[PDB]
Design a protein around this nucleic acid. Sequence first.
RNA 1: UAGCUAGUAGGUGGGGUAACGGCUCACCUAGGCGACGAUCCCUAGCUGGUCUGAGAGGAUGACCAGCCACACUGGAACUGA
RNA 2: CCCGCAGAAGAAGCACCGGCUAACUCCGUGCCAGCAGCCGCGGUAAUACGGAGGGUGCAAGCGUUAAUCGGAAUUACUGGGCGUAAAGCGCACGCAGGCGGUUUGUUAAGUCAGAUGUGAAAUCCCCGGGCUCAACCUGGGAACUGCAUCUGAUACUGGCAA
Lengths: 123, 82, 80, 129, 205, 156
Amino acid sequence: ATVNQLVRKPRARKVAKSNVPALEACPQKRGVCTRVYTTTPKKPNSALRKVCRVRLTNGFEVTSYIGGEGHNLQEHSVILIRGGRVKDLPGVRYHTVRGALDCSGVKDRKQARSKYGVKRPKA
Amino acid sequence: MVTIRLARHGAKKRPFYQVVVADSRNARNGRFIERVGFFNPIASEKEEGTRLDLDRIAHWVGQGATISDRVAALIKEVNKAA
Amino acid sequence: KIRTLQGRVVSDKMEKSIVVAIERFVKHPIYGKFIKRTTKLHVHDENNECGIGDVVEIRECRPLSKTKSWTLVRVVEKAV
Amino acid sequence: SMQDPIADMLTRIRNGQAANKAAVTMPSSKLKVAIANVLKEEGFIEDFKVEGDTKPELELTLKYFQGKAVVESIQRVSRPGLRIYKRKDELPKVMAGLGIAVVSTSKGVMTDRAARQAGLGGEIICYVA
Amino acid sequence: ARYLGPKLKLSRREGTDLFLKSGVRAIDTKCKIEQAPGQHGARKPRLSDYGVQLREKQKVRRIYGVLERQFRNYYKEAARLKGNTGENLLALLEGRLDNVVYRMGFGATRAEARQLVSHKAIMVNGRVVNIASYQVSPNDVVSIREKAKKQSRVKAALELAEQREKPTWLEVDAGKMEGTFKRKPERSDLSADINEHLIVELYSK
Amino acid sequence: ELQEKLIAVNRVSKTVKGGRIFSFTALTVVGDGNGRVGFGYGKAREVPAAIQKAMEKARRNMINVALNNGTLQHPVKGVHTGSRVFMQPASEGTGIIAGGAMRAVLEVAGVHNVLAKAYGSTNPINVVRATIDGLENMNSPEMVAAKRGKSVEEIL
RNA sequence: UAGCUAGUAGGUGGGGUAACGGCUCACCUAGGCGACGAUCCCUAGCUGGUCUGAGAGGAUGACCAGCCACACUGGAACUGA
RNA sequence: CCCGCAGAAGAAGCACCGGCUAACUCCGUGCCAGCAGCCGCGGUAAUACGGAGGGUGCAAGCGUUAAUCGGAAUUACUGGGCGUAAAGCGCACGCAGGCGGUUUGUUAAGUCAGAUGUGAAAUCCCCGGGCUCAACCUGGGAACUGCAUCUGAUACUGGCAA
Ligand SMILES: [Mg+2]
Ligand SMILES: [Mg+2]
Ligand SMILES: [Mg+2]
Ligand SMILES: [Mg+2]
Ligand SMILES: [Mg+2]
Ligand SMILES: [Mg+2]
Ligand SMILES: [Mg+2]
Ligand SMILES: [Mg+2]
Ligand SMILES: [Mg+2]
Ligand SMILES: [Mg+2]
Ligand SMILES: [Mg+2]
Ligand SMILES: [Mg+2]
Ligand SMILES: [Mg+2]
Ligand SMILES: [Mg+2]
Ligand SMILES: [Mg+2]
Ligand SMILES: [Mg+2]
Ligand SMILES: [Mg+2]
Ligand SMILES: [Mg+2]
Ligand SMILES: [Mg+2]
Ligand SMILES: [Mg+2]
Ligand SMILES: [Mg+2]
Ligand SMILES: [Mg+2]
Ligand SMILES: [Mg+2]
Ligand SMILES: [Mg+2]
Ligand SMILES: [Mg+2]
Ligand SMILES: [Mg+2]
Ligand SMILES: [Mg+2]
Ligand SMILES: [Mg+2]
């Protein structure tokens, strides 16, 4: 506190971490699907969450949530991840981009539509 | 050698020319010893467009600076004006 | 006329040479406290007159050695 | 040990104003009279006196106004652990000009208002607001 | 870059007339002015701090027709100039060229004063100027040029321009169709129900 | 002339033998448009009966503030129990740069141009007390002329 | 990461360089650096600036301009101001 | 840059609407399908999921992710704390270090004042000038908190002396 104590040993700032360490300060990374599966979330929630397991180009082997209603993913599919965690699934730090490189968009969607990779329907 | 030459510092299609005392081995828009005036070809009427500090140009020539071929027309012009 | 500096003899165990710590008293760039700092210099004295505890005054010259570019001018406060 | 005999002068004022003391006594000095002279000409204390031959003893007649202390706030600044010097355009304002800041300039200790006029800065002693 | 939706649909959200129509016919005969637009328009919920800071800021954009990144820069230029920031802001809006065409009455509304400017039919100092956002220093004369000085809508709008309360600080003619920007407006001669300080406190976070 | 603002309204409770029993705290502030500023605090079973009592208790225990033109006279601080508060004079053009419950007590006060900051807690109950505490010990250019037996021009 | 250093630290003389100098060599002396962080490991082009903030600061060094380093990798000289 | 002609023609999307936070209703599912920045929503009347109508915010752009600083007085020099919330060494002695009562003289290192030499240009700012406006470009300043040097002040701190 005192002015001799801050000369001999200055104030030190806490080096903050990141919660998306596999992106490595990149916006998106291309990965290869290795297992598609479902998972029940933690309590109080109850569903069957659709989430895959991706091998990233930089070498990291992470799980990645597949958003929206229904998809077309298999093993050995090549998709693009973005970050942002799903809270109620412990261990999922990444989302997938719908509409990028193997993943098709959500079918029959008309609202919040850019988020789900759907071309604009003409009416 | 030390030279008095022009330097293109303006926008595109609108050239502005800082005349600078420089060592002649540097780049055009690079290192210079002394800014000794300017020249504007896209100058309007009823204003100034060509101003040269002649107290320094006479200094550096007697020191031994050369003069650009284009500056030597601007020294020809202002010695019509006064 | 000449940019000169006082100092204090710290060791004179190498011959025709003395090492001189020059105290300076400079403020901190954050806190504003004043802090004593210490600058040693290898000084060339000819004729080997200096001993420990002796204040001395020095001046800068051409390099005499690998670490030695200062030479004294006069001496004050030899004794204890 | 007493490391700071000027902070005790301001403390004994600050403590006596809260105790409604008619006067505060303290040991005297040359620097304490020059501070207590700025404290009387600016108007914060009514009087000051010094008595004693071998060891003098200063005595400040403290000032009150309508039931409350005239010295509303009094603070040490340039303490022995941290010295404060300001050039003549870096001099502080206390209470936007409605309170003085006693400064030690080379023509004697004066206030900050008198030291801007002289065109010379100095060590700040205290804020008497 | 322009609002191309319904005009009186913006007056209903704010609450009074923003004068976006020429006003030959009465506004309480054309739109239900004291109800918000939409299905849930009659309900007036209680509005918060961020509501009334934003509603005041939208109200002064929507009178004059400026969009946000251009209206953001009017705040950083009102603040840069010397003196009172929020009163500098309205003097910038009142220096636009499509506003002088409306204060001199050459157009019906501030958008038809804009399209006189937008289609090269307005001189400033005897020079054709196209932009709705030309900032006008004093003594700069501004006029209908000879190309459009026989149009059926300009003198038809001067019949409306007499009916509006005349600005003090300008000058204009009826046959010569020239106008002089004599000074920039004092704040008291602007309308006094614009709460300019709320726009300041919205940006000054 | 007494303009009024209510700041916060919050639901409290109390356990009994039967169960929990609810009630409503309502926090206001008043002021006319110059130095007289006040606030009140009422609590009741139902909200219109509790904004009633706080606006009633606000119309008394009003206190004077020696205003300058539309602003402060000098920098000042004010504490009450969680909230240290700074507020600073300003010039015509910047508006109330304040926030929270500190904003509302500043509007009805009659002051229009402040720079300000809230440190410590920002409980809305205590921070209206730390800003009245700061306004009440703000001293005029003539109360300091009276205090040292002086004229104002010798103080500037 | 608490000890590091033998051309190492200084002295005298020969050579050497455009020039001062352990720059090199012979000889003597036994020093030199370090807790105000030597040595060691990890990282890194530097500034004018840029971004953020009321400020103090914190983060940063892309374009433009100044200086340094390299020219496939590791070495070396030649010619020449 | 300008003059004309024909023609409203060839030219609007994206997010959001439970609270934070500007913006609300019917129908579909039924702890499923889904949402989600935090708190939370969904188990049959969901202003929170999906579609609709309506609305709000920005607009040739709007979102999302990544990275930085701010809010964060949450490493606090400015500008925090340690009886019980995290935080006084179990107690002491004491070297370096930090700090040091009172008078006089002298000194002028810190301190202070003025002048001089440097602090590239660009950029930032101020007042102008030119591209129809703007962005952009340029003229003059101001600035560059610094560093050295010379002369002056001596209140205070340091040095020497009584
Ligand atoms: Mg949506
Ligand atoms: Mg301003
Ligand atoms: Mg808190
Ligand atoms: Mg030799
Ligand atoms: Mg030799
Ligand atoms: Mg590297
Ligand atoms: Mg800040
Ligand atoms: Mg290669
Ligand atoms: Mg090589
Ligand atoms: Mg050659
Ligand atoms: Mg919601
Ligand atoms: Mg709302
Ligand atoms: Mg959603
Ligand atoms: Mg149920
Ligand atoms: Mg339903
Ligand atoms: Mg911080
Ligand atoms: Mg943060
Ligand atoms: Mg704390
Ligand atoms: Mg504890
Ligand atoms: Mg104990
Ligand atoms: Mg002890
Ligand atoms: Mg002493
Ligand atoms: Mg000095
Ligand atoms: Mg100086
Ligand atoms: Mg510059
Ligand atoms: Mg202009
Ligand atoms: Mg002295
Ligand atoms: Mg002394």
